[PDB]
Motif scaffolding. Structure first.
Motif, mmCIF file in Angstrom:
data_model
loop_
_atom_site.group_PDB
_atom_site.id
_atom_site.type_symbol
_atom_site.label_atom_id
_atom_site.label_comp_id
_atom_site.label_asym_id
_atom_site.label_seq_id
_atom_site.Cartn_x
_atom_site.Cartn_y
_atom_site.Cartn_z
ATOM 1 N N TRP A 153 0.721 -1.050 0.234
ATOM 2 C CA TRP A 153 -0.216 0.261 0.160
ATOM 3 C C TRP A 153 0.801 1.553 -0.606
ATOM 4 O O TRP A 153 0.795 2.491 -0.904
ATOM 5 N N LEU A 154 1.756 1.029 0.519
ATOM 6 C CA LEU A 154 2.914 2.210 1.202
ATOM 7 C C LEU A 154 3.669 2.780 -1.026
ATOM 8 O O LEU A 154 3.773 3.904 -0.991
ATOM 9 N N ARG A 155 3.926 1.681 -0.825
ATOM 10 C CA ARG A 155 5.100 1.310 -1.851
ATOM 11 C C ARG A 155 4.072 1.499 -3.672
ATOM 12 O O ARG A 155 4.100 0.593 -3.708
ATOM 13 N N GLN A 156 3.655 2.583 -3.770
ATOM 14 C CA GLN A 156 2.442 3.210 -5.090
ATOM 15 C C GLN A 156 2.304 4.397 -6.111
ATOM 16 O O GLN A 156 2.769 4.956 -4.506
ATOM 17 N N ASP A 157 2.011 4.488 -7.237
ATOM 18 C CA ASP A 157 1.850 5.615 -7.848
ATOM 19 C C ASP A 157 1.047 6.269 -7.350
ATOM 20 O O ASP A 157 -0.039 5.563 -6.830
ATOM 21 N N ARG A 158 0.849 7.176 -6.307
ATOM 22 C CA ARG A 158 -0.095 8.465 -6.372
ATOM 23 C C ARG A 158 0.223 9.837 -7.046
ATOM 24 O O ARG A 158 1.135 10.081 -7.355
ATOM 25 N N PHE A 159 -0.894 10.826 -5.971
ATOM 26 C CA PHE A 159 -0.416 12.430 -6.810
ATOM 27 C C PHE A 159 0.709 12.446 -5.720
ATOM 28 O O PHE A 159 1.713 13.638 -5.660
ATOM 29 N N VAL A 160 0.929 12.013 -3.934
ATOM 30 C CA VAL A 160 1.907 12.218 -3.632
ATOM 31 C C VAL A 160 2.523 11.325 -3.449
ATOM 32 O O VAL A 160 1.328 10.207 -3.093
ATOM 33 N N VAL B 266 3.636 8.434 -0.666
ATOM 34 C CA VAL B 266 4.067 8.768 0.904
ATOM 35 C C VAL B 266 5.194 7.489 1.357
ATOM 36 O O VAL B 266 5.794 8.178 2.480
ATOM 37 N N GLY B 267 5.259 6.543 1.468
ATOM 38 C CA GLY B 267 6.315 5.313 1.331
ATOM 39 C C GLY B 267 5.884 5.308 3.188
ATOM 40 O O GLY B 267 5.349 6.067 3.463
ATOM 41 N N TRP B 268 6.962 4.277 3.623
ATOM 42 C CA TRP B 268 7.446 4.352 5.277
ATOM 43 C C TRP B 268 7.701 5.639 5.587
ATOM 44 O O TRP B 268 7.021 5.887 6.595
ATOM 45 N N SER B 269 8.493 5.897 5.272
ATOM 46 C CA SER B 269 9.451 8.015 5.339
ATOM 47 C C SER B 269 7.554 8.938 5.744
ATOM 48 O O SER B 269 8.580 9.449 6.583
ATOM 49 N N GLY B 270 6.786 8.731 4.696
ATOM 50 C CA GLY B 270 6.117 9.363 5.102
ATOM 51 C C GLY B 270 5.224 9.227 6.037
ATOM 52 O O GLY B 270 3.985 10.059 6.834
ATOM 53 N N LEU B 271 5.313 8.519 7.097
ATOM 54 C CA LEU B 271 4.691 8.428 8.030
ATOM 55 C C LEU B 271 5.165 9.207 9.513
ATOM 56 O O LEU B 271 4.380 9.037 10.083
ATOM 57 N N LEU B 272 6.728 9.627 8.750
ATOM 58 C CA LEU B 272 6.969 10.746 10.111
ATOM 59 C C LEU B 272 7.163 11.915 9.158
ATOM 60 O O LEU B 272 6.905 12.962 9.816
#
Ligand code: CLA
Ligand code: CLA
Ligand code: CLA
Ligand code: CLA
Ligand SMILES: C=Cc1c(C)c2cc3nc(c4c5[nH]c(cc6nc(cc1[nH]2)C(C)=C6CC)c(C)c5C(=O)[C@@H]4C(=O)OC)[C@@H](CCC(=O)OC/C=C(\C)CCC[C@H](C)CCC[C@H](C)CCCC(C)C)[C@@H]3C
Ligand SMILES: CC(C)=CCC/C(C)=C/CC/C(C)=C/CC/C(C)=C/CC/C(C)=C/CC/C(C)=C/CC/C(C)=C/CC/C(C)=C/CC/C(C)=C/CC1=CC(=O)C(C)=C(C)C1=O
Ligand SMILES: CCCCCCCCCCCCCCCCCC(=O)OC[C@H](CO[C@@H]1O[C@H](CO)[C@H](O)[C@H](O)[C@H]1O)OC(=O)CCCCCCCCCCCCCCCCC
Ligand SMILES: CCCCCCCCCCCCCCCCCC(=O)OC[C@H](CO[C@@H]1O[C@H](CO)[C@H](O)[C@H](O)[C@H]1O)OC(=O)CCCCCCCCCCCCCCCCC
Ligand SMILES: CCCCCCCCCCCCCCCC(=O)OC[C@H](COP(=O)(O)OC[C@@H](O)CO)OC(=O)CCCCCCCCCCCCCCC
Ligand SMILES: CCCCCCCCCCCCCCCC(=O)OC[C@H](COP(=O)(O)OC[C@@H](O)CO)OC(=O)CCCCCCCCCCCCCCC
Ligand SMILES: CC1=C(/C=C/C(C)=C\C=C/C(C)=C/C=C/C=C(C)/C=C/C=C(C)/C=C/C2=C(C)CCCC2(C)C)C(C)(C)CCC1
Ligand code: OEX
Ligand SMILES: [Cl-]
Ligand SMILES: [Fe+2]
Ligand code: NA
Lengths: 36, 348, 336, 27, 38, 32, 145, 194, 30, 76, 67, 31, 30
Positions: free
Chosen positions: B17-24, B26-32
């Motif tokens: 889920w986190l490693r998907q192409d989106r508008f922005v 997110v990734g794991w780093s997006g949790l921080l």
């Protein structure tokens, strides 16, 4: 989709932004921060 | 992984889920990065708009008091607070938000969240470079802004008396910090700062020269007068003449680049090295280990009433900065100095 | 074309086979810049003390008179001179010319002519190589800045003593006095210039990272990965397809810089236009247009002055103001 | 002994003293 | 893997790198000698 | 007079890396 | 030398304001028990009622070499006030090591500076090495894939 | 002793440079050169925990060693003395000298336990591949990370003072000057005597 | 000496840049 | 996919944005004009800068009792 | 190709004789994360004690602590 | 919708419009 | 005993755990 022209939308947003900046510059001469 | 059965867990679904192409991304780093950066920018915009600085600095630095964008700022806490982390739940605020704003806790909030946002952002650079299978030279380059931020907003106030001497998040606040470093530290005379200035100026020079050279060797690649549409990403040929560029700069400057590898590595190298040297200099200034004086020059001018240099002029200017700035700069010191002991020149 | 004196001179001057291109702009660039180099080096080494402020109080600025590289400087012309064009033949002696600051005028005039002809020579080589001519237009920004700090600011203030000293500590002195009297930090053109150099370093780091990262294997952990093929093939390495994807995924994948020409045009134009803006900010503050003045702008209902970060900057500026030229002022209001 | 006098004794020379920065609410 | 070391490598320094190293050393000396002599 | 400590430091900081780089360049140019 | 204690002409104990760490130099002022400036070593020396020679402060000293030596008239009072802004006045021998005059740093300060500089340099080293060990396949080569 | 140790380590370095192709560095399963880095880490953590426990239970407590430097709060009288460990919350007082033996004893015990755990337990395949535990560059990055963490910690304790940073050995503190530590104590002594 | 070291370092840097301009390695591959 | 060009042109966007954006603007206006910004973020009013007891710049000069002290020298 | 067979090398050989051996699944990563979280909490406690943001009954956090 | 794009866009847009209305209100505040 | 600063810090730990759980719930959703 395409009901209102995108250039018209951007133009209206441009006048709103220019007017907001004009209000911000006018408020530097009146009220608080006007040095008077 | 590695030709194994690898029965799926929650981690595989979360990673998918986190490693998907989106508008922005997110990734794991997006949790921080996303919450920390959003909170840092929102706290700065809130402090510049509503949170005052009348209690801590004795000055107005917000839009609700009559300050501009170049004037309002998120101000540091009081020097008597020291290096207190200034949590809302901490012993200073004691869970009271409207006094936590008045105590300068928003500066600590913005600083800590900005530091963790920088950590999360360069982690995001690592994650995206790993996803697209590219070397993390962007992260290596971004290590220098993180170093500058750490040394300036953390290491220097931790070396000084408290967060009060840290840069307040603003424009005129940063100008105050800069003039404070001029008057109290002689920061222009520091060789590390000189290296940083050289790095930034050379990096801007490299950017301008590289852009102009590429735009002036663009080949034909078309028939129209606009060369921008002459570019095609599908073709496998270079869009500009490296041979022509090398000969031009060899006959203009004497030396020129012959390798695009070395050109772009130099473009990466110069500002990062400059910012790292400036970070080391600010670390040196954190303990007041400053390159303030030249002993031979000061002894020469002490035993000679004729010997003057621009460095002696700078020393005299720094004395005036300190003397005329301390009284209104540091309210904790309670410097009620009369006007006659303050130094003056003639007639001004 | 081959048996004529001015002919052979013309196709030697305009020849592209020279190690350094001379050209018709070079015939003026080379002598002026060589003169400026010689006089600057000789003055920096052995210049006697010179009375910059016109108050019979000389400053040394030269290594043989007791200072180092950091604090050594070719000191500006005397205040008593003004911008009155003082060359050697207008002096009665070399000692008098040196005491009044003639080396600074000589070096500055020759340097201005040399950088202008250097820009013209850049155009000339671009013309003779079949190139596009706007590298000189990009170079026009440091030339504008040098002109603003060496010629235009002394013109506005009325004395070449206001010129930036040819040194390091002298540059810092010029900076601090300029702050005290024009509030350069609160000048929007200077903010544009600072943003320009910061963004120039930012974009240089980004471009270097994106081009150094987006590669296919051609250099191994050794000097080179030539095992596939040695030197002598046109099969190109590099990438700008995955680099743009990385840059897009970095923030939101809609600020499209997929055009390499547009990307390089942005890299060229941003620091150039910002250095243009800050050079013209210096040129405007030469005529005392100055920066933003927000001193005591914030007052309360009773009218008491609420302090401000701009007020703290004002206190530092006036502390600088009372130190500058401790002995050069006889009257209260600083106008000259 | 006199905690009020010694606090005022160190009042003029140095305003950053711990003895001043603690219990300053009562003053 | 044998009597010689398979990890044996040589160091390569061309004239551009020599010029860059000499320039860096001399510029660092120019910048810092004023402070070392003080 | 003479700051012999500064002289020794400057002379060593010039001599040692310059000699190191020159030796590397000579051994690189000797064996192409 | 002892504790430099300063008194006014009529008699009240003044105190020299101590130098903070931020200041390479500090103005020499002598302020009252209440917290009001009463004397100073002025820069302009042509105004007000705070110059030493007209306030009339005297330094007494109560320590080792100077235990009852009271100085009231000359500029030695100003010199002792300037020495008292640096803390306790001490006698120094500056001829054994040909001492400079400017203050030096402690081994604590040198240790802290060296270790903080090394700590940031090793932060960069760790970031570079973590980059290199996560990205080994692209630092060596992906072979057109 | 340090100089003699340096010479012995120089000789050992020469021996390891010459004799590098040792079968100990070769994998028995595949024949190629490999290092069992989790097991090496377990051995090293066991040794580090043993050294920490010994230094905290024998040297600093004075049952076999001399102890550490304990001084006056104002740095008047100080000497190398044995120190009794502090197992309460006061043991986390940075200026309490008793917190150093207690820390080293507890950390040595925990390091010995963790070294035994790493000696007995292999890592998981997911964590091994995620951290690249078969590579020496990954442990280089992690070790450098721990090293500048410790460098920042020692710089902070150096600048702010601690029980492991005596005033009589490293000089006073800028915060002691700013906060009027010695000045306040001097004035208090004078006031009490007067 | 004081000024002699500065002069020597400056002329050494100038000689290095002169050698870099004129006695450089000839450029290869573009 | 709604590439941000079709939505801004459509009237479905502006039907629901002719209320939300002006309502947010009016909400911010009332947040300022009701004194709620002063009450929430602790900024003093222009008439609440100097109390009768102190006529100079306030100083915090305490850490562990900073909450009690700022309640003491604030604008009541 | 045969390495230098050594007495101390074959003594220490078992400690390097299982390189590459791993456990299936996630192993003890949950216990590792629990220990890391406890370590982070403990580091926060000592950081706030040393920062005087966590006042305790027995901790004075000053030079009098060694009085 | 209420996707990641919606959440990010509105988390930027809503407080900016609120703060802009607040600032426009503060333009007419006089002492 | 349990100092109020310690009680507030333990409440802060609980609040941080709640925030981390909320972030985990938000990323398991959507
Ligand atoms: C999720 C992203 C995130 C991150 C990384 C941070 C990070 C930070 N915040 Mg922040 N915050 C966030 C979201 C986040 N925040 C949100 C959404 C809000 C709005 C509610 C806030 C509101 C907020 C405020 C008001 C403040 C901070 C502050 C801080 C800083 C210090 C916090 C601290 O010291 O406590 C540490 C927190 C932890 C150690 C986490 C606790 C983890 C526990 C121990 C897990 C245990 C649970 C366990 C598994 C249960 C099972 C066991 C059981 C079965 C027995 C810090 C850098 C403070 C600050 O800025 O300093 C000035 C502060 O004042 N934050
Ligand atoms: C981080 C480790 C460290 C620390 C904290 C110290 C700290 C200290 N040392 Mg020491 N030293 C060290 C390592 C260290 N040293 C090493 C590795 C050596 C072996 C070379 C020495 C050899 C040594 C001697 C011989 C002496 C000292 C002395 C001293 C004390 C005087 C202050 C000083 O160092 O002068 C000032 C420090 C500096 C100016 C640091 C330089 C700043 C940067 C790094 C320079 C940049 C280099 C530049 C690029 C090169 C170009 C310059 C060129 C033109 C010459 C001080 C407490 C003196 C002393 O008090 O006697 C006991 C003494 O004479 N040290
Ligand atoms: C204990 C820490 C440590 C260790 C074991 C390593 C190990 C390694 N590094 Mg690394 N590095 C470190 C810290 C460390 N680094 C730090 C702190 C930085 C930031 C400055 C870097 C930045 C760095 C880069 C950019 C690169 C490496 C590279 C390398 C690899 C070999 C290259 C080499 O060293 O050739 C020899 C190095 C030299 C001949 C340097 C010349 C000597 C310098 C200029 C002066 C030395 C100062 C003095 C004599 C020693 C005192 C320093 C000490 C007190 C810390 C190697 C495995 C390279 C790599 O990735 O491999 C491909 C690479 O390019 N490192
Ligand atoms: C027989 C071994 C031995 C012994 C008895 C000593 C003894 C001594 N050495 Mg020393 N040293 C040794 C070997 C030894 N050394 C070797 C092999 C080297 C080369 C690397 C050095 C290099 C060295 C230097 C550079 C210095 C000394 C110094 C000293 C003296 C003071 C030590 C001190 O207070 O610093 C304190 C020691 C430490 C702070 C070590 C802390 C270890 C860290 C915290 C480990 C943390 C990470 C760890 C892996 C985590 C484990 C997890 C845990 C749960 C277990 C002391 C007499 C000092 C001196 O005064 O010169 C004479 C000095 O500066 N030594
Ligand atoms: C003043 C100068 C300056 C600014 C403002 C700046 C800004 C930026 N740099 C970025 C990137 C970069 N900059 C780079 C190199 C450099 N950057 C430089 C100088 C700057 N860089 C220099 C000199 C270099 C050369 C070494 C690289 C290599 C990158 C990137 O890869 C990166 C990028 O992708 O560019 C698009 C952008 C993304 C950062 C981000 O979202 O972090 C996320 C974290 C956030 C938002 C939280 C941090 C909050 C900060 C640190 C504290 C709070 C501050 C308030 C929010 C605002 C205060 C403002 C007042 C002070 C006026 C951001 C716009
Ligand atoms: C008597 C005398 C001599 C008096 C002088 C006294 C005096 C004042 C002395 C000066 C002292 C002095 C030397 C000061 C400098 C000291 C100082 C601050 C040193 C900094 C040292 C340092 C290590 C800093 C770290 C930061 C760092 C690495 C900076 C380096 C900066 C740097 C080298 C920038 C690059 C400059 C530069 C001109 C770039 C070349 C650009 C160029 C020619 C590109 C050509 C080109 C472009 C293309 O696009 C393409 C496509 C091709 C093909 C191509 O070719
Ligand atoms: C630039 C970086 C970031 C800009 C966006 C972040 C800051 C936004 C908030 C600003 C604000 O709210 O001002 C709000 C202020 C409010 O205006 C103030 O209101 C007060 C009310 O009590 C008083 O009346 C003051 O007198 C009045 O000046 O408006 C301004 O300052 C006018 C200028 C508007 C801000 C422009 C910033 C950007 C300008 C140029 C950017 C160009 C290029 C950028 C390149 C990079
Ligand atoms: C690099 C990569 C990582 C990047 C960013 C990471 C961000 C981290 C943000 C949190 C960092 C810690 C912040 C609080 C630190 C603090 O409060 O310090 C201040 C406190 C001590 O507090 C001080 O104590 C003194 C004692 O005499 C005085 O009483 C001072 O008045 C008091 O303020 O120390 C700590 O809490 C931790 C110190 C140990 C770690 C310090 C690292 C930096 C060291 C600096 C040394 C001087 C320079
Ligand atoms: C503020 C004042 C704005 C002036 C901007 C100056 C533009 C050049 C500055 C950079 C220096 C050289 C860049 C190198 C360079 O020339 O870039 C490349 C590019 C050249 O494109 P073209 O030659 O196709 O466009 C010019 C005409 O020939 C159009 O057919 O320059 C421009 O894009 C000009 C458009 C700017 C439009 C106004 C801005
Ligand atoms: C009348 C002409 C006016 C111009 C004359 C003045 C120009 C001086 C020449 C620039 C310096 C030479 C750089 C050597 C270094 C050198 O020759 O490296 C050679 C290098 C060429 O690199 P390549 O493309 O060959 O790189 C691939 C290699 O790895 C393989 O060979 O040049 C460059 O890096 C590009 C230009 C950078 C030039 C940076 C300017 C540095 C400023 C120096 C300031 C000295 C201090 C002040 C004096 C006290
Ligand atoms: C504080 C705090 C917080 C946070 C918050 C947040 C995160 C939010 C936000 C927010 C925000 C985020 C806000 C904002 C603002 C903004 C603004 C105020 C804007 C503007 C202005 C202007 C002036 C503009 C201009 C322009 C430009 C420059 C660009 C384009 C064009 C235009 C014209 C538009 C909490 C509660 C958690 C708690 C703790 C503390
Ligand atoms: O000469 Mn240089 O500078 Ca244009 O100001 Mn007036 O005069 Mn001086 O004063 Mn400030
Ligand atoms: Cl001046
Ligand atoms: Fe390029
Ligand atoms: Na004057």
């Amino acid at each position: 989709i395409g009901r209102i022209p995108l250039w018209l939308v951007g133009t209206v947003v441009g006048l709103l932004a220019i007017g907001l900046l004009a209000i911000f510059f006018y408020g530097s001469y009146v009220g608080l921060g006007s040095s008077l | 992984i590695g030709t194994y059965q690898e029965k799926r867990t929650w981690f595989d679904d979360a990673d998918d889920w986190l490693r998907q192409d989106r508008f922005v991304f997110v990734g794991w780093s997006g949790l921080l990065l996303l919450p920390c950066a959003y909170f840092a920018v929102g706290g700065w915009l809130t402090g510049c708009t509503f949170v005052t600085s009348w209690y801590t600095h004795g000055l107005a630095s917000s839009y609700i008091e009559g300050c501009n964008f170049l004037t309002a700022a998120v101000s540091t806490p009081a020097n008597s607070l020291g290096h207190s982390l200034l949590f809302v739940w901490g012993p200073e605020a004691q869970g009271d938000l409207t006094r936590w704003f008045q105590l300068g806790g928003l500066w600590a909030f913005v600083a800590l969240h900005g530091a963790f946002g920088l950590i999360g952002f360069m982690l995001r650079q690592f994650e995206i470079a790993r996803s697209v299978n590219l070397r993390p030279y962007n992260a290596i380059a971004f290590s220098a802004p993180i170093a500058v931020f750490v040394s300036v907003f953390l290491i220097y106030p931790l070396g000084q008396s408290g967060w009060f001497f840290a840069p307040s998040f603003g424009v005129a606040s940063i100008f105050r910090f800069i003039l404070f470093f001029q008057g109290f530290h002689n920061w222009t005379l520091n060789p590390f700062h000189m290296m940083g200035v050289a790095g930034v100026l050379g990096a801007a020079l490299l950017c301008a020269i590289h852009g102009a050279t590429v735009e002036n060797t663009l080949f034909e690649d078309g028939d129209g007068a606009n060369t921008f549409r002459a570019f095609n990403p599908t073709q496998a040929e270079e869009t500009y003449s490296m041979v022509t560029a090398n000969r031009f700069w060899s006959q203009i400057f004497g030396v020129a680049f012959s390798n695009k590898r070395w050109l772009h590595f130099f473009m990466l190298f110069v500002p990062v090295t400059g910012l790292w040297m400036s970070a080391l200099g600010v670390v040196g200034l954190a303990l007041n280990l400053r390159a303030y004086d030249f002993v031979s020059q000061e002894i020469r001018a002490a035993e000679d009433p004729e010997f003057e240099t621009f460095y002696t002029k700078n020393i005299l200017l720094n004395e005036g900065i300190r003397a005329w700035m301390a009284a209104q700069d540091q309210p904790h010191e309670k410097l009620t100095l009369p006007e006659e002991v303050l130094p003056r020149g003639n007639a001004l | 074309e081959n048996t004529s004196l001015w002919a052979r001179f013309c196709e030697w001057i305009t020849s592209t086979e020279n190690r350094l291109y001379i050209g018709w702009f070079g015939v003026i660039m080379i002598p002026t810049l060589l003169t400026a180099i010689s006089v600057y080096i000789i003055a920096f080494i052995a210049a006697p003390p010179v009375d910059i402020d016109g108050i019979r109080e000389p400053v040394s600025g030269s290594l043989l008179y007791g200072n180092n590289i950091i604090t050594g400087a070719v000191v500006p012309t005397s205040n008593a001179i003004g911008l009155h064009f003082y060359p050697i033949w207008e002096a009665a002696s070399l000692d008098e010319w040196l005491y009044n600051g003639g080396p600074y005028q000589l070096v500055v005039c020759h340097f201005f002519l040399g950088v202008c002809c250097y820009m013209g020579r850049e155009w000339e080589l671009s013309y003779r190589l079949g190139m596009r001519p706007w590298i000189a237009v990009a170079y026009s920004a440091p030339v504008a800045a040098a002109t603003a700090v060496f010629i235009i600011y002394p013109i506005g203030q009325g004395s070449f003593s206001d010129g930036m000293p040819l040194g390091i500590s002298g540059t810092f002195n010029f900076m601090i006095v300029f702050q005290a009297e024009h509030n350069i930090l609160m000048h929007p053109f200077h903010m544009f210039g600072v943003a320009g150099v910061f963004g120039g370093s930012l974009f240089s780091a980004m471009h270097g990272s994106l081009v150094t990262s987006s590669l296919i294997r051609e250099t191994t952990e050794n000097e080179s990965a030539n095992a596939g093929y040695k030197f002598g093939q046109e099969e190109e390495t590099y990438n700008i397809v995955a680099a743009h994807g990385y840059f897009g995924r970095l923030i939101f994948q809609y600020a499209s810089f997929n055009n390499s020409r547009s990307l390089h045009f942005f890299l060229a134009v941003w620091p150039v236009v910002c250095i243009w803006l800050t050079a013209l900010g210096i040129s405007t503050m030469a005529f005392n247009l100055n920066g933003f003045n927000f001193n005591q702008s914030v007052v309360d209902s009773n009218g008491r002055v609420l302090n401000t970060w701009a007020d703290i900057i004002n206190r530092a500026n006036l502390g600088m103001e009372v130190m500058h030229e401790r002995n050069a002022h006889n009257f209260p209001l600083d106008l000259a | 002994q006199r905690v009020r006098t010694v606090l005022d004794m160190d009042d003029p020379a140095k305003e950053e003293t711990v003895k001043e920065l603690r219990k300053d609410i009562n003053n | 893997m044998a009597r010689p070391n398979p990890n044996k490598q040589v160091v390569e320094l061309n004239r551009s790198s020599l010029y860059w190293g000499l320039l860096l050393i001399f510029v660092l000396a120019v910048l810092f000698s004023s402070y070392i002599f003080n | 007079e003479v700051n012999i400590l500064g002289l020794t430091a400057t002379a060593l900081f010039i001599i040692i890396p310059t000699s190191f780089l020159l030796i590397l360049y000579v051994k690189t140019a000797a064996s192409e | 030398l002892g504790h430099a204690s300063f008194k006014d002409q009529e008699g009240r104990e003044l105190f020299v304001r101590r130098m903070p760490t931020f200041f390479e130099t500090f103005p020499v002022v002598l302020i009252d028990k209440d917290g009001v400036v009463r004397a100073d070593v002025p820069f302009r020396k042509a105004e007000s009622k705070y110059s030493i020679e007209q306030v009339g402060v005297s330094v007494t000293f109560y320590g080792g070499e100077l235990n009852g030596l009271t100085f009231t008239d000359p500029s030695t009072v100003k010199k002792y006030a300037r020495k008292a802004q640096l803390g306790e006045i001490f006698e120094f021998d500056r001829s054994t090591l040909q001492s400079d005059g400017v203050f030096r740093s402690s081994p604590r300060g040198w240790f802290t500076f060296g270790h903080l500089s090394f700590a940031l340099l090793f932060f960069f080293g760790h970031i570079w090495h973590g980059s290199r060990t996560i990205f080994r396949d692209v630092f060596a080569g992906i072979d057109e894939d | 002793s340090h100089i003699v140790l340096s010479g012995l380590l120089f000789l050992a370095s020469v021996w390891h440079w010459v004799y590098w192709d040792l079968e100990l560095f070769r994998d028995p399963r595949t024949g190629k050169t490999a290092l069992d880095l989790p097991k090496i880490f377990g051995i090293h953590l066991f040794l580090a925990g043993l050294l920490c426990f010994g230094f905290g239970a024998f040297h600093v407590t004075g049952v076999f060693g001399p102890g550490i430097w304990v001084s006056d709060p104002y740095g008047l009288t100080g000497s190398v003395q044995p120190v009794a460990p502090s197992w309460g919350a006061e043991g986390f007082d940075p200026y309490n000298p008793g917190g150093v033996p207690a820390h080293h004893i507890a950390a040595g015990i925990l390091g010995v336990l963790a070294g035994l755990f790493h000696l007995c337990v292999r890592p998981s395949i997911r964590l091994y591949f995620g951290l690249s535990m078969g590579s020496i560059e990954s442990v280089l990055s992690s070790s450098i990370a721990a090293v500048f963490w410790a460098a920042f910690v020692v710089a902070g304790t150096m600048w702010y003072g601690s029980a492991a940073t005596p005033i009589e050995l490293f000089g006073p503190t800028r915060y002691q000057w700013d906060q009027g530590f010695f000045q306040q104590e001097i004035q208090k002594r004078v006031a009490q005597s007067t | 000496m004081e000024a002699l070291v500065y002069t020597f370092l400056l002329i050494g840097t100038l000689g290095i840049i002169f050698f870099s301009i004129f006695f450089r390695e000839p450029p290869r591959i573009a | 996919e709604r590439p941000f060009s079709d939505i801004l042109t459509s009237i479905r966007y502006w039907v629901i944005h002719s209320i939300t954006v002006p309502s947010l603007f009016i909400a911010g206006w009332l947040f300022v004009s009701t004194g709620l910004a002063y009450d929430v973020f602790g900024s003093p009013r222009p008439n609440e800068y100097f109390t009768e007891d102190r006529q100079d710049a306030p100083l915090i000069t305490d850490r562990f009792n900073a909450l009690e002290q700022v309640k003491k020298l604030s604008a009541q | 190709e045969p390495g230098i067979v050594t007495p101390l090398g074959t003594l220490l050989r078992p400690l390097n004789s299982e390189a590459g051996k791993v456990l299936p699944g996630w192993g003890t990563t949950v216990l590792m994360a629990v220990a890391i979280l406890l370590f982070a909490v403990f580091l926060l406690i000592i950081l706030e004690i040393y920062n005087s943001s966590l006042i305790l009954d027995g901790v004075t956090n000053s030079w009098e602590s060694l009085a | 919708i209420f996707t990641v794009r919606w959440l990010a866009i509105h988390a930027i847009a809503v407080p900016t419009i609120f703060f802009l209305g607040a600032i426009t209100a503060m333009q007419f505040i006089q002492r | 005993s349990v100092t109020p600063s310690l009680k507030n810090f333990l409440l802060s730990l609980v609040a941080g755990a709640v925030v981390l759980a909320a972030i985990a719930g938000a990323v398991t959703a959507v």
